[PDB]
CSV table of C-alpha atoms in Angstrom, one decimal:
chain,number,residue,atom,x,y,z
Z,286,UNK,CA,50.4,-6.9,-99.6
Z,287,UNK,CA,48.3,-4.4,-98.6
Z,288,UNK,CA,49.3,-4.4,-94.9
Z,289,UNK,CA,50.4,-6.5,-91.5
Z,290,UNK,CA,47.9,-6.4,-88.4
Z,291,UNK,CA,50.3,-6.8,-85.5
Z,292,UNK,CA,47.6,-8.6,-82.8
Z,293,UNK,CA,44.7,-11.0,-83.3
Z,294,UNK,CA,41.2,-10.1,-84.7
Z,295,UNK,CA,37.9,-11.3,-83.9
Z,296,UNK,CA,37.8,-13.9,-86.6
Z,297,UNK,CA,40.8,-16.1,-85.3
Z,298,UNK,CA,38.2,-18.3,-84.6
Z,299,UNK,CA,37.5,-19.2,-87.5
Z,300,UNK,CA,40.8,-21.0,-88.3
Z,301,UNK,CA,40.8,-22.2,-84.6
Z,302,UNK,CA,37.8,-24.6,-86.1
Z,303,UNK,CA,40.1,-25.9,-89.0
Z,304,UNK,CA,43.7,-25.9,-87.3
Z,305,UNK,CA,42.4,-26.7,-83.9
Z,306,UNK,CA,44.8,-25.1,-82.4
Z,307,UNK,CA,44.5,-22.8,-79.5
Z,308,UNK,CA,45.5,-19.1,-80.0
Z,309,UNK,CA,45.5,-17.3,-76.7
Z,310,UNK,CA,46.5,-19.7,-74.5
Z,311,UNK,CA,49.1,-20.4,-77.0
Z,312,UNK,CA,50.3,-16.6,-77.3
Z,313,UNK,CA,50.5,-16.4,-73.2
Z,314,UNK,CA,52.6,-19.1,-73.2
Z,315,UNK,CA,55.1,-17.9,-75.9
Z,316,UNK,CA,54.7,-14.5,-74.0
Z,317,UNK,CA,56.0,-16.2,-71.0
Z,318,UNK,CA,59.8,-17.7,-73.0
Z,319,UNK,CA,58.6,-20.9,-74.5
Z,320,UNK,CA,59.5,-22.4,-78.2
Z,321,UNK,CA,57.6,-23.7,-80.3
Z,322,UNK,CA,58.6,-27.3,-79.7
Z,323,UNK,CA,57.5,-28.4,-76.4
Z,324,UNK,CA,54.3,-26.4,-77.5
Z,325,UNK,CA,53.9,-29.2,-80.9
Z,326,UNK,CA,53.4,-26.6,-82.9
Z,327,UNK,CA,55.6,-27.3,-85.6
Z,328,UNK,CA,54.6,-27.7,-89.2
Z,329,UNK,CA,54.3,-31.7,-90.4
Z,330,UNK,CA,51.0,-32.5,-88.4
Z,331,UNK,CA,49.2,-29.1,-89.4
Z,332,UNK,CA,46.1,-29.8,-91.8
Z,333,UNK,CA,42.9,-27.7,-91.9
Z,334,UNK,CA,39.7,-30.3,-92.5
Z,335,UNK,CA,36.3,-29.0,-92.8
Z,336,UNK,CA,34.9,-25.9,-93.3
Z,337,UNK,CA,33.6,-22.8,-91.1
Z,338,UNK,CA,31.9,-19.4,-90.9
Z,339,UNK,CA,31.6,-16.3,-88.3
Z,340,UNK,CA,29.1,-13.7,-88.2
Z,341,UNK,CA,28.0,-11.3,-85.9
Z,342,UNK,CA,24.9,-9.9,-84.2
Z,343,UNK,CA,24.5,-6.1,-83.9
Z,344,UNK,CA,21.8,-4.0,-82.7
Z,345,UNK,CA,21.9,-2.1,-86.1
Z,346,UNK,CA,18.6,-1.7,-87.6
Z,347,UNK,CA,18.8,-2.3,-91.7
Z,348,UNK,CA,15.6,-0.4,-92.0
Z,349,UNK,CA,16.2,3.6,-90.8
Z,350,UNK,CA,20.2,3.7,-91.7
Z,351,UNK,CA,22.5,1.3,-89.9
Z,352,UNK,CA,22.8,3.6,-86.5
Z,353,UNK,CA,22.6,1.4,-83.3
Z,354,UNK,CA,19.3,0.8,-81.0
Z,355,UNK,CA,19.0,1.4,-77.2
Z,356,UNK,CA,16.7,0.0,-74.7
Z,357,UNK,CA,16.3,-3.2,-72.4
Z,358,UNK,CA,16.5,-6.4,-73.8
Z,359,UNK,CA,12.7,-8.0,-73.0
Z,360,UNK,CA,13.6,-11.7,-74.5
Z,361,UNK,CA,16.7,-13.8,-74.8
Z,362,UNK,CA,16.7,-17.7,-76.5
Z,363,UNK,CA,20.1,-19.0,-77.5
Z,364,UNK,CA,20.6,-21.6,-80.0
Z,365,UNK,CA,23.2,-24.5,-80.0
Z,366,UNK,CA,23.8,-28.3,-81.2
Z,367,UNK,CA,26.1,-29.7,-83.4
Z,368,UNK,CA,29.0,-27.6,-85.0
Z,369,UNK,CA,28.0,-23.9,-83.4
Z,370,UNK,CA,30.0,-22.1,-80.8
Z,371,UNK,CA,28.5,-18.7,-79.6
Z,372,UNK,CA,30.9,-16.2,-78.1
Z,373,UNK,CA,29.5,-13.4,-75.8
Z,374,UNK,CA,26.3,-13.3,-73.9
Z,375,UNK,CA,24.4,-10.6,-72.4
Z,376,UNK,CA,21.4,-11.6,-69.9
Z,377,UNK,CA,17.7,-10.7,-69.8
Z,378,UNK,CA,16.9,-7.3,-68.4
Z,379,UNK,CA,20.1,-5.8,-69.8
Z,380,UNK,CA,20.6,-2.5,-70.9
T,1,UNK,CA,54.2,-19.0,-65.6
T,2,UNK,CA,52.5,-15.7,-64.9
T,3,UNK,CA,51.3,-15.8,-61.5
T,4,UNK,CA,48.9,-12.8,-62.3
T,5,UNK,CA,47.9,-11.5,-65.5
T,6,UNK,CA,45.3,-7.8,-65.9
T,7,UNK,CA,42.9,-7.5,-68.8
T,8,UNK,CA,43.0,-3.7,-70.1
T,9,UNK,CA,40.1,-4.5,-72.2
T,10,UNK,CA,36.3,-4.7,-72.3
T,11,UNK,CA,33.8,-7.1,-73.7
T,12,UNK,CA,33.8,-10.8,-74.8
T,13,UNK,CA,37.6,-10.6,-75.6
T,14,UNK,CA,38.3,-10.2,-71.7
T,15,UNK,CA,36.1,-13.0,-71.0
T,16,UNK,CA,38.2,-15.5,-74.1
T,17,UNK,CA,41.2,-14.3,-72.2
T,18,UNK,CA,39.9,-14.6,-68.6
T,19,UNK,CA,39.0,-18.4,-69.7
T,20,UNK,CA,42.4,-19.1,-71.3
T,21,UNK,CA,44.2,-18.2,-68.1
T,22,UNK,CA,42.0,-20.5,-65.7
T,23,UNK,CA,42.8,-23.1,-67.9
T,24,UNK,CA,46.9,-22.5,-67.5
T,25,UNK,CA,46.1,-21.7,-63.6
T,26,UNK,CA,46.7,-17.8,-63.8
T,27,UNK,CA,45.2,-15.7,-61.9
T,28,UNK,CA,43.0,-12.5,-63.5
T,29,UNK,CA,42.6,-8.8,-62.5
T,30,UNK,CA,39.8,-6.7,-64.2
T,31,UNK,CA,39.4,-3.1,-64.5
T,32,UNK,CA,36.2,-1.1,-64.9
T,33,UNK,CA,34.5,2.1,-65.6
T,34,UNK,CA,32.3,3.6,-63.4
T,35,UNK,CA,29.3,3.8,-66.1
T,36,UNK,CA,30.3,0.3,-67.1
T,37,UNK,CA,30.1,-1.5,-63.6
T,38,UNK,CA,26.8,-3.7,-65.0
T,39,UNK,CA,29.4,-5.5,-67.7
T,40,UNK,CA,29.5,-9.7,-67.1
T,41,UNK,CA,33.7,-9.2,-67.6
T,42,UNK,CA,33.8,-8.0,-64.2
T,43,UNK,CA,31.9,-10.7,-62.5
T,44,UNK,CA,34.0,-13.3,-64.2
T,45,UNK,CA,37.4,-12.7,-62.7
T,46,UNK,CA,38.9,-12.9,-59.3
T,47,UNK,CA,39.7,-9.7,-58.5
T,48,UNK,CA,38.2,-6.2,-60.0
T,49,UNK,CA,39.2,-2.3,-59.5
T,50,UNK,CA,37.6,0.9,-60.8
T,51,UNK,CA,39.6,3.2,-63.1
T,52,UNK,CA,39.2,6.9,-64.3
T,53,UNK,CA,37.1,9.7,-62.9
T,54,UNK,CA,32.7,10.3,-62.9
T,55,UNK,CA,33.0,11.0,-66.7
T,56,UNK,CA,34.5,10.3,-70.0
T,57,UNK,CA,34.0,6.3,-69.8
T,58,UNK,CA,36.0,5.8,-73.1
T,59,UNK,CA,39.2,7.8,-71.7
T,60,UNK,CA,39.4,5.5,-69.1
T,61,UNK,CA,40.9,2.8,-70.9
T,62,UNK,CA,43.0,5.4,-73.1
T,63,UNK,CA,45.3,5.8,-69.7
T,64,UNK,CA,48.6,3.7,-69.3
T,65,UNK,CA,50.1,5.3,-66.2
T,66,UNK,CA,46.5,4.4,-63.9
T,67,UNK,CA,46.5,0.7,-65.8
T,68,UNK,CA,50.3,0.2,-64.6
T,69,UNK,CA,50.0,1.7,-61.2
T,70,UNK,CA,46.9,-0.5,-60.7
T,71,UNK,CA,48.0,-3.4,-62.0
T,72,UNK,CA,51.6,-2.5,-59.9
T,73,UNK,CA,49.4,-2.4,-56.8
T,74,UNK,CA,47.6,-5.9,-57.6
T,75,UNK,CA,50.8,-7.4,-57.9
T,76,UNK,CA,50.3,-8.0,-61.6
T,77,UNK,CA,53.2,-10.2,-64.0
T,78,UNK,CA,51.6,-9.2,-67.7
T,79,UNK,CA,49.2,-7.1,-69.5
T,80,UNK,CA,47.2,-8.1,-71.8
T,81,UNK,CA,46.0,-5.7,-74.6
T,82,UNK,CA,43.5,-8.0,-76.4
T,83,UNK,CA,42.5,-6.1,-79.6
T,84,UNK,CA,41.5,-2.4,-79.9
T,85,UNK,CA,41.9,0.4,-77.2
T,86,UNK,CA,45.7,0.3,-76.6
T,87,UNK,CA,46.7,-2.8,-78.6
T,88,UNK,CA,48.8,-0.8,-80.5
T,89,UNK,CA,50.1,2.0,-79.0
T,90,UNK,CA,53.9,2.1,-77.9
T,91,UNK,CA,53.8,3.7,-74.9
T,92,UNK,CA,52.4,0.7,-72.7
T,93,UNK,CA,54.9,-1.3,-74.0
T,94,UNK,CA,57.5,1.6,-73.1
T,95,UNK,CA,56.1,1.6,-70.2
X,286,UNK,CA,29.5,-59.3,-76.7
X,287,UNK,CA,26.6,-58.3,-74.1
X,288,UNK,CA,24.5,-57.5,-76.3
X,289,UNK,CA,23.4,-54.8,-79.3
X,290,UNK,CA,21.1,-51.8,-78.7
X,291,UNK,CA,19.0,-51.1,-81.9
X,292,UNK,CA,19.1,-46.9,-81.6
X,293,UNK,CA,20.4,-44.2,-80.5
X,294,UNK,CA,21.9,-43.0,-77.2
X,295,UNK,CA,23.0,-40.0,-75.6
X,296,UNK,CA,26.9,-40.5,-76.0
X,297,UNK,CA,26.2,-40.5,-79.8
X,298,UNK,CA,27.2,-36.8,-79.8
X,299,UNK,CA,30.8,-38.1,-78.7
X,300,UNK,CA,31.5,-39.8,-82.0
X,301,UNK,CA,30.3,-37.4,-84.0
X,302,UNK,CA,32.9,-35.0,-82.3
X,303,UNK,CA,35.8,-37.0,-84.1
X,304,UNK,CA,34.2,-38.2,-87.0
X,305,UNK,CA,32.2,-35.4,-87.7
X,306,UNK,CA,29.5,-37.1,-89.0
X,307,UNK,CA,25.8,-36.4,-88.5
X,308,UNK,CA,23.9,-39.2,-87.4
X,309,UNK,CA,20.3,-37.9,-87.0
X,310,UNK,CA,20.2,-36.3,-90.8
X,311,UNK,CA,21.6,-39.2,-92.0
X,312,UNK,CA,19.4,-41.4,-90.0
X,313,UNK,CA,16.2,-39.6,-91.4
X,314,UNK,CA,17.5,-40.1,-95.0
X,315,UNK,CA,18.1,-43.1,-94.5
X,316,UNK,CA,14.6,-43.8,-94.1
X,317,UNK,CA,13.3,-42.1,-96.9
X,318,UNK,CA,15.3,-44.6,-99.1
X,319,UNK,CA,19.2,-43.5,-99.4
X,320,UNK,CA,21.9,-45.6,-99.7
X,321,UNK,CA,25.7,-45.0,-97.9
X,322,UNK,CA,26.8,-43.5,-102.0
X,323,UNK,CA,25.2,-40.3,-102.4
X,324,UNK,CA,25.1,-39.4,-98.7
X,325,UNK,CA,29.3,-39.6,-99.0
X,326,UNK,CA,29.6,-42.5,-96.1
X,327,UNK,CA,32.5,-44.3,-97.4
X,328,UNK,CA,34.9,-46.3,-95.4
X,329,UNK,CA,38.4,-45.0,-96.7
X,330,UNK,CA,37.9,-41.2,-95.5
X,331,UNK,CA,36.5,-41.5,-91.8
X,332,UNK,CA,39.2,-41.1,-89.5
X,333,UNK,CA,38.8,-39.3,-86.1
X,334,UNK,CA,41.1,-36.6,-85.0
X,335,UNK,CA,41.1,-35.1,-81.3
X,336,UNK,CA,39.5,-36.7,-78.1
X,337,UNK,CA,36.3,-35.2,-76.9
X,338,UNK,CA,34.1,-36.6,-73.6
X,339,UNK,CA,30.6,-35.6,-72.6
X,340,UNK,CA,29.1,-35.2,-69.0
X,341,UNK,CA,25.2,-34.7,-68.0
X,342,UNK,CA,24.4,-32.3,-65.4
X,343,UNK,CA,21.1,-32.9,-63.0
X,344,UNK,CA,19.2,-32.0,-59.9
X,345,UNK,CA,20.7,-34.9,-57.8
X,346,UNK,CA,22.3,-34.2,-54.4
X,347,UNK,CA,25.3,-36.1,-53.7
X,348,UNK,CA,25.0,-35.2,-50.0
X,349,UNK,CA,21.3,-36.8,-48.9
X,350,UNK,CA,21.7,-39.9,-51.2
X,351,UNK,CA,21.4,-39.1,-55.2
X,352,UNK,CA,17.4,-38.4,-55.2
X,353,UNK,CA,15.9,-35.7,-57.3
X,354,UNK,CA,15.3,-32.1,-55.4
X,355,UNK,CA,12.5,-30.3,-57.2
X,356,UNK,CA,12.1,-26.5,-57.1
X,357,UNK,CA,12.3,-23.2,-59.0
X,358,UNK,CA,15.3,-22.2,-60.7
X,359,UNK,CA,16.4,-18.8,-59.1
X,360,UNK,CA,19.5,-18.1,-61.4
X,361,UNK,CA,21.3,-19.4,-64.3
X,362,UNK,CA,24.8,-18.7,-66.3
X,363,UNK,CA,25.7,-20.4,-69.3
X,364,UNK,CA,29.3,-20.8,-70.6
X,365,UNK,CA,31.3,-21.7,-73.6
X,366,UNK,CA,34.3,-21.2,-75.8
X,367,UNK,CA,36.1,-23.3,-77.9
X,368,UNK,CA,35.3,-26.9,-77.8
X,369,UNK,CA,32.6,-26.5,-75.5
X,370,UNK,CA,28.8,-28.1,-77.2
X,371,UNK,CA,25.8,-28.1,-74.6
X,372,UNK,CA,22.7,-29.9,-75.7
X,373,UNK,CA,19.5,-29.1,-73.5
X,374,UNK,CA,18.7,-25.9,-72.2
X,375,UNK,CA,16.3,-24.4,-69.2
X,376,UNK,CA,15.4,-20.8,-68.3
X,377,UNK,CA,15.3,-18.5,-65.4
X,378,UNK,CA,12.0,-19.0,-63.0
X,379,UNK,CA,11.4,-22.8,-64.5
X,380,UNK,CA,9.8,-25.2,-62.4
């Protein structure tokens, strides 16, 4: 029990593959006085099946240190198909 | 629900919570930097206001009375922290 | 029974959506000589979960008829999230 993180992290999405259950819109609704019973969230038809993974892109550079790289981004493909979700996109030409 | 919700945060977090409210038909309120007026977060919400002085971009966030007063003047209902920057800190939620 | 088309469509992304099955893999091992044993494709564990639905996007104009406008693409924005899956992508200045 080494400690409680009071908010969500950047990895909820991870579970939100397995549980498939929404997580912000479901913690603005709560915010806003409902139950968890006209929400369905209640614990008989929870069960995670499959599995998933996260990672991240930085700009770090794994051969001088690990210190972050400015400049203008010259070239931008994307990737997709079945079973990847990308969240966060920047734009050609960005600094 | 909410009628109007303001995102005190910055990045792709902004954007999952800016999606989450269209979906439950809740209008969204971004705030910016001066040095960070090129971010996609504020092109992706109805309405967007400039915070904190010509310097000290970071600060900016780090500010609960300009965040309330602008999200007062908005006619903001909630505030969502997101993660990071004030998303633990009692005095916005004294305030 | 109208009749039976011997491939595959472009809906086929739908199923796999619920029963999380690839179909293209499978169809290429298939052909090198595989049977439904090793590959796991077993009828007592395929059961779909969820409801998914697909659209296609194109160049027609619903107001001068539905024929195809040709042209160079000026500007483009993405999107995506949670259960979001685009197949087929363009880029900026395509003709």
């Amino acid at each position: 029990f080494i400690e409680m993180n009071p908010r969500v992290q950047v990895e909820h999405t991870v579970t939100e593959e397995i549980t498939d259950v929404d997580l912000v819109a479901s913690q603005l609704r709560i915010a806003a006085g409902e139950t968890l019973e006209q929400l369905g969230l209640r614990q008989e038809d929870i069960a995670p099946h499959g599995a998933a993974l996260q990672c991240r892109i930085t700009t770090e550079d794994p051969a001088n240190g690990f210190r972050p790289d400015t400049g203008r981004i010259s070239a931008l493909r994307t990737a997709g198909g079945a079973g990847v979700r990308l969240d966060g996109s920047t734009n050609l030409g960005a600094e | 629900m909410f009628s109007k919700v303001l995102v005190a945060n910055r990045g792709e977090i902004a954007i999952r919570a800016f999606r989450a409210a269209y979906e439950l038909g809740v209008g969204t309120v971004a705030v910016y930097p001066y040095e960070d007026r090129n971010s996609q977060h504020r092109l992706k919400a109805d309405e967007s206001y400039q915070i904190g002085d010509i310097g000290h971009p970071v600060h900016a966030y780090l500010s609960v009375d300009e965040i309330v007063a602008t999200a007062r003047r908005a006619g903001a209902d909630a505030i969502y922290p997101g993660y990071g920057f004030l998303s633990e800190n009692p005095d916005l939620a004294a305030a």
